């Protein structure tokens, strides 16, 4: 297995702009055996470039590759909407056969900063009847992807007991959404009254807190 | 016309083995190198090995040497990959790909390695003021195995503002996810909101009507 790095980890650009993606090997790439792949969610990777600069059949002219030694580049001359995806470089070799994918660069759509809309959901009565209680905090349609969620139970800051999930960037408004879920037994949930999630984001001048009282 | 069709999803206990298949379709008139590549959740693809067009030779990635075997049946244009001593980390989508530079790809086969039993989801409401008059509601789809589940709203009529989150693997070994939708708070008395949950591995189809509490 070869050793590869890709910079930047995330490239945020607008449609029509030029994208330059870098791949660096720890040691000089023998024979310039360096390829590039595109991958979208729910799909297999797609070959773009092989041999550092050869475009695969059917790949648009806006994709081009160049490089030698340790430093290789993939350029997308003008980003089309279908071009926002993850891109992997890959070093390969013949003796012995070896193909090593790089760590990947995500090319995302840059847009104006959008603050999250925050919602908190108490566990349902149906779920509580089953002995379990899930509390859900929703952060809806925000940008950029970075955010912080802090759980508070009777104003006690929580850690280590939540699980988070983030959607893919929306195709229409370029935002992200995130859920954070606190799962407790019915008995543990009934021990406490105030349940709150506090959200920090660049679009928020001050942290936003949503909360509910168990019972009301 | 170079295309590859892979076998269906597998669920295996830790320590067991799995044998995946990859059949060429379309232009099956010549033989090509075939690779196997896997991708664990949230990770990038990982090359596992290659078998040459005749099937007389193979080379496996060092990480999989001694654990993986590739074979091919020229009569059926089918390539096989067997992975033994399965571990939790082997849960992944497994792809086959063809030619020298992985020029074309199969659709992938999900393999889940777990001691859990097939279990349909329990679907709970995320019941819905807001300055713009926008209410959020949803369904919590909890404690199912294995992946995947599908969620739609109003039998596909409602798609705008829907966010169905990627599942998380809980410490129970079961998966959970939520699907949410934002609606006009004024519609909470005019429109009905039903999430349609389909978990094909358990043949479970649940329709759940989400109401203000």
């Amino acid at each position: 297995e070869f050793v590869l790095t890709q910079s930047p980890g995330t490239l945020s650009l607008s449609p029509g702009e030029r994208a330059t993606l870098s791949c660096r090997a720890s040691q000089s790439v023998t024979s310039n055996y360096l390829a590039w792949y595109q991958q979208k969610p729910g799909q297999a990777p797609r070959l773009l470039i092989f041999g550092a600069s050869s475009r695969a059949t059917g790949i648009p002219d806006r994709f081009s590759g160049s490089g030698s030694g340790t430093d290789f580049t993939l350029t997308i001359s003008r980003l089309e909407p279908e071009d926002f995806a993850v891109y992997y470089c890959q070093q390969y070799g013949s003796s012995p056969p070896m193909y090593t994918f790089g760590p990947g660069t995500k090319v995302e759509i840059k847009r104006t900063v959008a603050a999250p809309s925050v919602f908190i959901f108490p566990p349902s009565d149906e779920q509580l009847k089953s002995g379990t209680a899930s509390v859900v905090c929703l952060l809806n349609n925000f940008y950029p992807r970075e955010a912080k969620v802090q759980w508070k139970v009777d104003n006690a800051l929580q850690s280590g007991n939540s699980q988070e999930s983030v959607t893919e960037q929306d195709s229409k408004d370029s935002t992200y959404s995130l859920s954070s879920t606190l799962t407790l037994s019915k008995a543990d949930y009934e021990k406490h009254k105030v349940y709150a999630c506090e959200v920090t984001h660049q679009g928020l001048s001050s942290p936003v807190t949503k909360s509910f009282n168990r019972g009301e | 016309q170079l295309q590859l069709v892979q076998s269906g999803a597998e669920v295996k206990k830790p320590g067991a083995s799995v044998k995946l298949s990859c059949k060429a379709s379309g232009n099956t008139f010549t033989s090509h190198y075939i690779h196997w590549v896997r991708q664990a959740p949230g990770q990038g693809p990982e090359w596992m090995g290659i078998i040459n067009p005749s099937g007389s030779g193979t080379r496996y990635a060092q990480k999989f040497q001694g654990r993986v075997t590739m074979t091919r049946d020229t009569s059926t244009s089918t390539v096989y990959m067997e992975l033994v001593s399965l571990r939790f980390e082997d849960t992944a989508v497994y792809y086959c790909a063809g030619d020298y530079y992985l020029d074309y790809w199969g659709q992938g086969t999900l393999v889940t390695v777990s001691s859990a039993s097939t279990k349909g989801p329990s679907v709970f409401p995320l019941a819905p003021s807001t300055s713009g008059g926008t209410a959020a509601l949803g369904c919590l789809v909890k404690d199912y195995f294995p992946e995947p589940v599908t969620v739609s709203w109003n039998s596909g009529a409602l798609t705008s503002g829907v966010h169905t989150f990627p599942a998380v693997l809980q410490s129970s070994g079961l998966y959970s996810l939520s699907s949410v939708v934002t609606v006009p708070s004024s519609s909470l008395g005019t429109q009905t909101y039903i999430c349609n949950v389909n978990h094909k591995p358990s043949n479970t189809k649940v329709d759940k009507k989400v109401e203000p509490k």
Partner: peptide
């Protein structure tokens, strides 16, 4: 590359 890869497998036909 292609000829080199073929060559690796030469002893097995």
């Amino acid at each position: 590359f292609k000829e080199e890869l073929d060559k690796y497998f030469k002893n097995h036909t």
